[PDB]
Amino acid sequence: DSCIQFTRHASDVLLNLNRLRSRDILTDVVIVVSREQFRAHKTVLMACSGLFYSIFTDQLKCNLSVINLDPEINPEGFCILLDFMYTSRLNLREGNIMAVMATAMYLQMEHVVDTCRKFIKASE
Amino acid sequence: DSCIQFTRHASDVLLNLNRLRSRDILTDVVIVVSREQFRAHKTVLMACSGLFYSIFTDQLKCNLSVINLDPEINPEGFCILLDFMYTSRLNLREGNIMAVMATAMYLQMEHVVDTCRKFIKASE
Amino acid sequence: WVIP
Amino acid sequence: WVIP
Ligand SMILES: N#Cc1c(Cl)ncnc1Nc1ccc2c(c1)CC(=O)N2
Ligand SMILES: N#Cc1c(Cl)ncnc1Nc1ccc2c(c1)CC(=O)N2
Ligand SMILES: [Cl-]
Ligand SMILES: [Cl-]
Ligand SMILES: [Cl-]
Ligand SMILES: [Cl-]
């Protein structure tokens, strides 16, 4: 086509989706990770994670307001990945890398798994 | 903070939100523009338009499944802007610029209004 | 705005 | 990935 493109559009959309999340506006699911609960937008979760894409395209699970993750999942690791989904920013640290990598593998977030593998290999 | 950032993340999220829209997955509103209907995600509309942000943060309108736009709004102009919301790509042409600009003013999409004004000024 |  |  003969379209023009606004370079910052995708980043501005994501910034606004994060603002809606922070204000709990039109959030439609709560992700339960052991004792912790995280409110989010199903569409953002699906757009970022192979696992959520699978869950919310399921004819029964698409209608659930609560999703319980595997008990082995670390809440902090999930929190870091949820923030990454809404911001493109990953708070990767020596103290959380193993938890973040395990959570990204479970959530099927290949690019996160890739940088965790690379950061781990550099430290050995 | 000491975060790392994935450059293509925002663009990949938007591409997936557009894929969900094309497959009518978790769309939660229909925008009626005279004889035409457009299915969308309320969160994407709010993230792109001052008008939809106002509408869906309203305590009564947030729960509506159908929104009727002003009869003066051109369906093609709306279609072009809806595509832009989900892709960052604006199909701006000599034959549609007036309709696109009027629709962007109504929808409160300042960056679109700006490029329409600039393209019009260059042709006079 | 750019030509993509 | 980059340093933002
Ligand atoms: N929502 C949506 C969606 C759609 Cl519509 N099409 C294709 N993938 C979608 N999302 C999704 C699927 C698999 C993975 C990711 C996201 C990140 C990753 O590492 N794996
Ligand atoms: N969703 C959301 C949202 C939030 Cl949370 N905060 C601030 N603006 C939001 N969206 C929004 C408001 C005003 C305008 C636009 C988008 C584009 C434009 O030209 N005007
Ligand atoms: Cl439920
Ligand atoms: Cl990822
Ligand atoms: Cl309704
Ligand atoms: Cl805009």
Chain A residue numbers touching C3 (CB-CB < 8 A) = 4-5
| Contacts B48 to A, Cβ<8 Å | 13, 16
User: Which chain B residues contact residue D4 at CB under 8 A?
Assistant: 3-5
Structure's resolution in angstroms:
1.7
Please name the residues in contact with B104: beta carbons below 8 A apart, sequence gap of 6 or more: B81, B112, B113, B116
- Structure letter (DSSP) for residue C4: -
What is the radius of gyration, based on Cα positions, of chain B?
16
* Integer-rounded Cα radius of gyration of chain A: 16
> Please, what's the b/e burial string for A51-74 (b: 16 or more CB within 10 A of its CB; e: otherwise)?
bbbebbeeeeeeeeeebebeeebb
Question: Could you tell me the two tokens for A23?
Answer: 């204000």
Torsion of CA B102, B105, B111, B114, to 10 degrees: 60
The conformation of residue D1, written as its DSSP 8-state character, comes to -
Query: Which approach determined this entry?
Result: X-ray
Q: Judge whether B113 and B44 are in contact, CB under 8 Å.
A: no
Closest CA to B100 of B86, B114, B88, B87: B114
Which residue(s) pair with B67 in the sheet?
B31
Query: Is beta strand B36-40 parallel, antiparallel or unpaired with respect to B29-33?
Result: antiparallel
CA distance A4 to C2: 6
Would you state the structure tokens that stand for residue B76, as one six-digit string?
Answer: 């093609």
Query: B121 Cβ partners below 8 Å, 6+ apart?
Result: none
- Find the A72 Cα to ligand 3 centroid distance in Å: 21
Compute how many other C-beta atoms are within 10 angstroms of the C-beta atom of residue B83: 17
Q: At a CB cut-off of 8 Å and minimum separation 6, what does A84 contact?
A: A48, A90, A91, A109, A112, B6, B9
Position C4: which residue type?
A: P
C2 class by beta-carbon count within 10 Å (0-12 exposed, 13-18 middle, 19+ buried): exposed
The binding-site residues of ligand 1, defined as CB within 6 angstroms of any ligand atom, are: A 46-50, 53, 108-110; B 16, 19-20
**Farthest-apart Cα atoms in chain B, separation:** 52
Spell out the domain ranges in chain A.
1-124
For residue B111, the CA-to-ligand 6 centroid distance in Å is 4
For residue B35, with 0-12 CB atoms within 10 Å meaning exposed, 13-18 middle and 19 or more buried, which class applies? Answer: exposed
How far apart are the C-alpha atoms of B71 and B78, rounded to whole Å?
12
Contact A67, A31 (CB under 8 A): yes
Q: Would the CB of B46 count as within 6 Å of ligand 2? A: yes
Q: Which chain D residue is nearest to residue B9, measuring alpha carbons?
A: D1
Residue A54 CA, distance from chain mean position: 14
DSSP 8-state secondary structure symbol assigned to residue C2: B
CA angle A93, A40, A81 (to 5 degrees): 15
- CATH class of residue range A1-124: alpha beta
